[PDB]
Assembly symmetry: C2
Homo-oligomer: 233 residues x 2
Amino acid sequence: YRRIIVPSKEFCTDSGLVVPSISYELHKKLLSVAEKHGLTLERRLEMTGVCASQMALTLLGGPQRPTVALLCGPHVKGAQGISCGRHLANHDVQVILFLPNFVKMLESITNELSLFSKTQGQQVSSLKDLPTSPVDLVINCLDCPENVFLRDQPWYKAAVAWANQNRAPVLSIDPPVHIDAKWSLALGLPLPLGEHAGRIYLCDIGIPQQVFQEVGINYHSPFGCKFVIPLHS
Amino acid sequence: YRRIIVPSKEFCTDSGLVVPSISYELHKKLLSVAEKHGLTLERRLEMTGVCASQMALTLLGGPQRPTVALLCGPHVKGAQGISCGRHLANHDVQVILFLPNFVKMLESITNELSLFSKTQGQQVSSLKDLPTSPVDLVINCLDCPENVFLRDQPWYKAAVAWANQNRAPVLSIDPPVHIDAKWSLALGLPLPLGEHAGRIYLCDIGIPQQVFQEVGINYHSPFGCKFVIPLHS
């Protein structure tokens, strides 16, 4: 039944609990309020990396080491990818992180890269440095909602072309609404993601119940004991 | 076999991998270097809360709601308990958090309580406000290594007495070396915890391989695909 009421796609859990989508703006408002009450970006980046890497370890079978190609953009969504990549590298996954070069440094990127640099992971700026043969998993964090001209950039188009030619299944962490992912990972509550997001999962990102209430969402947890759950149309 | 070499108790994993203890001083050094490289306290508090709550949810049976009494001190170890408590509350566990009153405020406590206040959790400063009947789980975060006189304090002795009389099993998150815990949770690498720690588990707190090397530890992950693992003598 319906325990989450928003003030547009609707999903349900394995147990039948309805989880509706929220708009980009309401998701942004929710996170801002969460941040005001002490759930900082750095905290969320850390938790998102742990919980995403747990999901990806499940996708990798979770018993040579499996190989993951991580495709990150120069934005906060790409920083979430680097966190996930560091946690995977910490757990003996062969991680190759692609991130194009840029000039305007971003705090979250700088911080995640600093920790990633101390792992056995490989950071590359060229798509040619990525494996030729299909990897076990591609993780896609190339696109960000705030960069409307990002999808027109040659570097982006090449990265997408690389993912399509590799043949490994694609997990997209926190993709935008408008690469065909095998799976996609929504955070907190889903945006109205469509068929190109593939199999949709939801990740808990630490948001207390009353933060939802403050933005006019009547929220009850759809997670049970799990931090990442499958969602169905 | 031995893939973790330190410059004192030794544990092993289910698969036979040897995990040695390290001194308090080396553990402190390890985390300081981790911090220097961007693994801030706030990130670790969030991660520790997630992974400890995941462990606690397994102890709770991982399916009325289960009930947890959280006993925290006015210190960083107590802040780790509050983090675990907020994550449990987010997952529909009935959480009652004990923290005694104090005057010298602490950033980590303040930030964790701010988030916990927005959950359905209950914060209390009196032991009489805790259940009269056995709860499902007691989580102990009462003691901290930095305070040698803490155990002499009436408030602490009372809290320990409360835990001993409740009948519920006790999980101790990150206890000091010198309450008989059923299980204890070590972080990153274990201290030489003895028999009063009960069944010892190790939690991944997100520390990259090369941070260990910088403090003289030849480290290889004992975790496999798990973020919390049981250790045996």
